[PDB]
């Protein structure tokens, strides 16, 4: 239920960096980011409209590591909820436990954050929570376990987290290794390069 | 010192292999009476008593006179429990007897003295020497005319190719029969039929040379007995416990089933000589019989007992551990735990019965085909038992299948029969043909009869073909592929997805064997 292949391949196919690595090293120094993977990568074939919608959907799905079945459930839930479908879907995706752990900087990559959640090292409201897909709600405080609080990778990720922009919907205390999800992130806080309207019309044929 | 240890030590397993019309069933009945399970014993065909032999549960004694179905009876002796295995013996069958022989720790061969050792016994003895199993020789029907003891001993030793040692020596032949033991104690039966029905009175008199005994029996017989006895001592080696264990020498006891005399003596000797069960060897490691944890293998499976509903019973020897009712026993082959809700044991006596089965006791398990021959049930260990004979079939006949439909019915019946050891089915890779082979002609006849009886197909057969089965295994890579391409037509798949070379002629097999030496041709799978 997890993609176990090369991570940079996905980034090359999408053209941009999907943040699948820590970010300590320059992306260009590890891959040919502007070139699609494989033997016939040099050519840039003219993509169809269905193609650009599918590419955007796959781009988001690979960004957050979600699979198709889970993603379609997320879309159904978002469509069911009140308001803008795209904002609801982005909020639902952003409400995942491992995603919030990555935003708080406990894990360098989202895959590392997911392994952290799954390996019983995170506690939501003091209770141990193991499910990577756990939806967190407003005013919830999340923290590392006492046993896992001495891991080198956690601090190694916290220092790296400073290089990236700080989320305005979270409050993290790097000393005690705790954060607080006070509200669901507004679209203006999210990266504007994602055209979520493509996904919301791709899935509603 | 512990009770389980004492019980495994007391348990003994012995099987009887006999020639046609040798009185094995009658002997079995006598054994139960001596063991005290039954107060009275009845001869086959009800010649002297109303009761019938225990071994012949069915009507086989009236139909032919020999047991056609395998029977296991457990009887208790003096501070010991003995497991008795009865196997039908014929050239036509044989393979089933070999499976039973592999499972049983020790074996006894019963032959009527007049009929002799002559045929099928050498083959049985050969399988026992291959496993180095201890063998006991029992002479039968002493009430009838009996040939010279020295001559009988020499001929049986000559056919067997193993040393023959006589525990009991006959001083009488024909109408009057008496015998003498190695301890010099003389056992006599005054009443031929008077004590036959009940337990025979134990009138054994100490001292080889006794004047009253000499006067009572023939004087000439006593003198001849003394000369024959000293000559036997010099000519043939005295019984050695180690040699018997090794299988080098076989103990011989002379007894009469009809007379009911000598069977008790044989039982006493067999119980002292017989040892506690040897550790069986699994492919992973040898498993100790004493060690806890339930380990067993199914030597034989009986099917189609009831026509309307099929209730397969699997005879399994639990080599290690003690069975408990409702215990979950892991099947190694399927890698799954099966609860043994129902397990049939044979008390064979006037006892209440107990659910718990000790190690070395045969257990029948009811199933719908779930259990298969050679399956291993273990408490938790992933160990697969070894030693199943799986001999090659001969005189193969193709199944024509005149009616195009009912093939799935035929296929289900053929695979089920193939799962048991009665018949082996081979399919050539080149063409879609079904060829069925069995070790014996009457085995084919039984298979065809059973198939018609419950799987109810036309089963047209005997289409002309000539074949011999040799299983082919090659460890080397890139050589076996060449062998397959060279003789694809000859090669045929066998059950269990095993590749077997089919030889038109023995000479063809020899030529095939000389060519491609890296590839190994195995008679037994």
């Amino acid at each position: 239920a997890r993609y176990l292949g090369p991570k940079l391949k996905l980034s090359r196919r999408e053209g941009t960096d999907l943040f699948l690595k820590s970010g300590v090293r320059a992306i260009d120094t590890k891959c040919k980011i502007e070139q699609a993977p494989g033997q016939h990568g040099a050519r840039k074939p003219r993509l169809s409209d269905y193609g650009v919608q599918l590419r955007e959907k796959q781009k988001v799905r690979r960004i957050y590591g979600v699979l198709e079945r889970q993603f379609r459930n997320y879309y159904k839930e978002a469509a069911r909820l009140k308001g803008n479908t795209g904002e609801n879907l982005l909020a639902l995706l952003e409400g995942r436990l491992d995603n919030v752990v990555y935003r708080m900087g406990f894990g360098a990559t989202r895959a590392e954050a997911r392994q952290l959640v799954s390996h019983k090292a995170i506690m939501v409201n003091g209770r141990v929570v193991n499910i990577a897909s756990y939806q967190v709600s407003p005013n919830d405080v999340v923290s590392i376990r006492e046993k896992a609080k001495k891991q080198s990778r956690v601090k190694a990720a916290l220092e790296l987290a400073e290089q990236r922009e700080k989320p305005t919907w979270l409050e993290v205390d790097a000393g005690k290794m705790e954060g607080t999800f006070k509200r669901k992130p507004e679209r203006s806080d999210l990266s504007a390069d994602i055209n979520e309207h493509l996904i919301v019309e791709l899935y509603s044929k | 010192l512990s009770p389980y240890l004492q019980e495994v030590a007391k348990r003994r397993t012995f099987a009887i292999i006999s020639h046609p019309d040798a009185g094995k069933t009658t002997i079995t009945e006598k054994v139960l009476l001596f063991g005290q399970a039954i107060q009275t014993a009845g001869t086959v065909k009800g010649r002297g008593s109303n009761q019938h032999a225990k071994s012949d549960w069915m009507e086989m004694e009236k139909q032919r006179g020999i047991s056609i179905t395998t029977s296991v009876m457990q009887f208790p002796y003096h501070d010991c429990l003995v497991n008795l295995l009865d196997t039908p013996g014929h050239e036509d069958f044989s393979e089933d007897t070999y499976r039973t022989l592999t499972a049983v720790d020790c074996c006894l061969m019963v032959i009527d003295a007049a009929k002799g050792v002559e045929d099928r016994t050498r083959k049985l003895m050969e399988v026992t020497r291959l496993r180095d199993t201890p063998i006991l020789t029992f002479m039968n029907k002493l009430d009838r005319d009996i040939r010279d003891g020295m001559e009988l001993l020499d001929e049986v030793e000559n056919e067997l190719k193993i040393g023959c040692a006589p525990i009991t020596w006959p001083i009488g032949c024909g109408k009057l029969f008496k015998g003498v033991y190695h301890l010099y104690k003389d056992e006599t039966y005054l009443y031929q039929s008077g004590k036959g029905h009940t337990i025979q009175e134990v009138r054994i008199v100490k001292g080889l040379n006794n004047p009253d005994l000499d006067a009572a029996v023939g004087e000439d017989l006593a003198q001849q007995l003394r000369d024959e006895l000293e000559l036997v001592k010099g000519a043939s080696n005295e019984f050695d416990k180690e040699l018997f264990l090794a299988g080098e020498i076989t103990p011989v006891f002379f007894g009469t089933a009809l007379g009911n005399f000598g069977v008790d003596h044989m039982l006493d000797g067999l119980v002292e000589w017989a040892p506690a069960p040897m550790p069986r060897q699994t492919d992973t490691r040898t498993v100790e019989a004493s060690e806890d944890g339930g380990g067993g293998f199914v030597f034989k499976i009986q099917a189609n007992m009831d026509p309307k509903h099929r209730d397969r019973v699997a005879f399994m020897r639990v080599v290690s551990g003690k069975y408990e009712k409702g215990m979950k026993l892991r099947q190694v082959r399927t890698a799954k735990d099966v609860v043994i809700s129902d397990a049939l044991t044979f008390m064979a006596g006037d006892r209440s019965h107990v659910e718990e089965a000790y190690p070395g006791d045969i257990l029948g398990l009811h199933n719908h085909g779930t259990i298969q021959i050679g399956d291993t049930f273990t408490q938790g260990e992933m160990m697969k038992f070894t030693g199943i004979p799986n001999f090659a079939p001969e005189l193969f006949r193709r199944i024509r299948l005149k009616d195009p439909l009912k093939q799935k019915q035929l296929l289900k019946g053929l695979v089920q029969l193939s799962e048991e050891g009665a018949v082996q089915v081979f399919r050539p890779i080149s063409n879609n043909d079904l060829i069925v082979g069995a070790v014996g002609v009457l085995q084919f006849d039984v298979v065809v009869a059973r198939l018609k009886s419950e799987y109810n197909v036309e089963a047209v057969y005997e289409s002309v073909n000539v074949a011999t089965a040799r299983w082919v295994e090659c460890k080397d890579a890139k050589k076996f592929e060449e062998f397959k391409r060279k003789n694809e037509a000859a090669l045929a798949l066998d059950g269990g997805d095993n590749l077997a070379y089919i030889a038109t002629s023995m000479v063809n097999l020899r030529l095939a064997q000389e060519r491609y030496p890296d590839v190994q041709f195995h008679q037994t799978r």
Partner: protein, 61 residues
């Protein structure tokens, strides 16, 4: 009538096969396909792609 897919077959008369439906556009009157790998019809030999459609076990390395 049923079309026997794949390259090469061991099918002779009196063989029990399994038809599954699906016509071939370019044959008049053939409307069904026989599944490869069911009760007697062996799979297509030396097939390494689209193996599931013709019933061949995975080749062990």
């Amino acid at each position: 009538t049923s079309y026997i897919g794949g390259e090469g077959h061991n099918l002779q008369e009196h063989s029990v096969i399994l038809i599954r439906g699906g016509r071939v556009k370019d044959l008049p009157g053939v409307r069904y396909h026989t599944v490869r790998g069911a009760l007697d019809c062996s799979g297509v030999k030396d097939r390494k792609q689209a193996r599931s459609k013709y019933g061949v076990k995975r080749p062990k390395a």
